[PDB]
Amino acid sequence: MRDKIRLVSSAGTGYFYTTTKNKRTMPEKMEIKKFDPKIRQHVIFKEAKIK
Template structure:
């Protein structure tokens, strides 16, 4: 969402070989937005 807020979760690489996409609540904009999997900075 570009707000700098992020969630961490675990992922089974065998059942989810691609990038993870989850719709979660972003408290910065107070809306549900798509969270895409990236490297932790």
């Protein structure tokens, strides 16, 4: 089953998105460009535990 994960801004603002992923087919950590509203720029977001 797909597991829930957080995508955390690399700008250090603490902003984050949430999504799901299949760990069997995507073992590596997700990295994707997303818009951060605290700094109003597009930056890289990285996978973290849903916690």
